[PDB]
Design an enzyme around this catalytic site. Structure first.
Site, short mmCIF file in Angstrom:
data_model
loop_
_atom_site.label_atom_id
_atom_site.label_comp_id
_atom_site.label_asym_id
_atom_site.label_seq_id
_atom_site.Cartn_x
_atom_site.Cartn_y
_atom_site.Cartn_z
N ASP A 277 -8.26 -1.12 -1.09
CA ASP A 277 -7.85 -0.22 -2.16
C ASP A 277 -6.46 -0.68 -2.68
O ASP A 277 -5.48 -0.60 -1.95
CB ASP A 277 -7.79 1.21 -1.58
CG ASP A 277 -7.62 2.29 -2.64
OD1 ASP A 277 -7.88 3.49 -2.37
OD2 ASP A 277 -7.22 1.93 -3.75
N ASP B 26 -10.42 -0.99 -8.68
CA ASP B 26 -9.48 -1.34 -7.62
C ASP B 26 -9.94 -1.04 -6.21
O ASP B 26 -9.11 -0.82 -5.32
CB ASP B 26 -8.16 -0.64 -7.87
CG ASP B 26 -8.20 0.81 -7.46
OD1 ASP B 26 -9.23 1.47 -7.68
OD2 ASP B 26 -7.20 1.28 -6.92
N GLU B 27 -11.25 -1.03 -6.00
CA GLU B 27 -11.80 -0.74 -4.68
C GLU B 27 -12.97 -1.63 -4.34
O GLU B 27 -13.78 -1.95 -5.21
CB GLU B 27 -12.32 0.69 -4.59
CG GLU B 27 -11.30 1.76 -4.52
CD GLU B 27 -11.98 3.10 -4.50
OE1 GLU B 27 -12.90 3.28 -5.31
OE2 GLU B 27 -11.60 3.95 -3.68
#
Ligand SMILES: Nc1nc2c(ncn2[C@H]2C[C@H](O)[C@@H](COP(=O)(O)OP(=O)(O)OP(=O)(O)O)O2)c(=O)[nH]1
Ligand SMILES: [Ca+2]
Ligand SMILES: [Ca+2]
Ligand SMILES: [Ca+2]
Length: 341
Positions: free
Chosen positions: A7, A105-106
């Site tokens: 993350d 973003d993961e």
DNA sequence: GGGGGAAGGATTCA
DNA sequence: CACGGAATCCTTCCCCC
């Protein structure tokens, strides 16, 4: 199964820092300026320097300004963040074929047959972190456990710029201690229904009649929570693919005037098509946000693909249908395309 | 009764 | 004052065998 979850830290704000280092150190707020008035719009996110004072994703830009009138406010540049993101995702792929990109973003990596025990998994965490930091100057938080859910919980617990493992032992522990609201997928609405049923921890879902739970939060959500309670959650890491593409814009003023609304709509259609690229949708929905910040939509599925020409006229009808089924003015208008060939 | 979609909304997370 | 983008799930309405 051994899942490693990544993350990216305060991602949009951090990318702006990487691109303009002089920003580092002071509060940075990335905003979505709606164009209505001066500082109309919301915050997409802010670096931790800004969060210390409550400026975070979701609050009106005007409220953030009151708190930190001297902070640096930057317009959100989604395409830039996406390319940096894509590069980082290509780097994680060098650690596992089995990879699930969850958002900009993961990512979840299935490193089961790539390492044994947690000691080696953790070290793979550090390597990954260090690599990303050196290649893109981006710090991220890593979470590791037996499944995606606790891997993500692991990360939330280590943010920012951290790394944490939740071994088979702590998983059992959290099932009895972890506030159920902290479980991914349990929002405010669901948290309250559970409270009223007396369910405060995952463990509680085991002593309640399934039908009861089922009736208050849904079969899906009920099985999910119980599954985790019985340490039986094991959804595989899988590749996700875009399912819908759309655009929505805030008008300069509220209106119910078709002529006044149409250009925004058509603009929304044009942009969505550019983003569709090679994809051909079979379904289209016109989405409107009322004066009272409410959301209404009308759509239609065709037996064939939709040409932009077919989108224009069909979207006009749906809009007329919205207007003739809701008296409120419209504040935001948009379109979404789905059911790709 | 139930298989199989489609339409509009609820809810969640980024 | 209140952004943009998007997935999954839920209820309801249909058509039909
Ligand atoms: N436009 C918009 N974008 C959002 C919103 N929430 C999150 N995003 C985008 C920008 C965030 O940088 C990015 C990652 O979301 P997170 O929920 O992971 O926030 P962020 O990474 O900024 O902080 P973090 O270190 O994870 O606590 O997703 C939002 O409410 N509106
Ligand atoms: Ca993040
Ligand atoms: Ca995230
Ligand atoms: Ca929650």
């Amino acid at each position: 199964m051994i899942v490693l979850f990544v993350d990216f830290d305060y991602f949009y704000a951090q990318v702006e820092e990487v691109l303009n280092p002089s920003l580092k150190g002071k509060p940075v707020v990335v905003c979505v300026f709606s164009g209505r008035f001066e500082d109309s719009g919301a915050v997409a996110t802010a670096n931790y320097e800004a969060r210390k004072f409550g400026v975070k994703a979701g609050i009106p830009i005007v409220e953030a300004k009151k708190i930190l009138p001297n902070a640096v406010y930057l317009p959100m540049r989604k395409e830039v963040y996406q390319q940096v993101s894509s590069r980082i995702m290509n780097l994680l792929r060098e650690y596992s074929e089995k990879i699930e990109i969850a958002s900009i973003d993961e990512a979840y990596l299935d490193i089961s047959d790539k390492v044994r025990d947690y000691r080696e998994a953790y070290n793979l965490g550090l390597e990954i972190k260090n690599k990303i930091l050196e290649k893109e100057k981006i710090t991220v938080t890593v979470g590791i456990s037996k499944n995606k859910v606790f891997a993500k919980i692991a990360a939330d617990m280590a943010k920012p710029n951290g790394i944490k493992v939740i071994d088979d032992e702590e998983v059992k522990r959290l099932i009895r201690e972890l506030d159920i609201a902290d479980v991914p997928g349990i929002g405010n609405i669901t948290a309250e229904k559970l409270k009223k049923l007396g369910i405060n921890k995952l463990v509680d879902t085991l002593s309640i009649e399934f039908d009861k739970l089922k009736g208050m939060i849904g079969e899906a959500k009920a099985k999910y929570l119980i599954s985790l309670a019985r340490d039986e959650y094991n959804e595989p890491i899988r590749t996700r693919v875009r399912k819908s593409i759309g655009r929505i814009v805030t008008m300069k003023r509220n209106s119910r005037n078709l002529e006044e609304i149409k250009p925004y709509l058509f603009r929304a259609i044009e942009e969505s098509y550019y983003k569709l690229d090679k994809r051909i949708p079979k379904a289209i929905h016109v989405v409107a946000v009322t004066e009272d910040l409410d959301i209404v939509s009308r759509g239609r599925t065709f037996p064939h693909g939709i040409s932009k020409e077919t989108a224009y006229s069909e979207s006009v009808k749906l809009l007329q249908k919205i207007l003739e089924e809701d008296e409120r003015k419209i504040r935001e208008i948009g379109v979404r395309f789905s059911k790709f060939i």
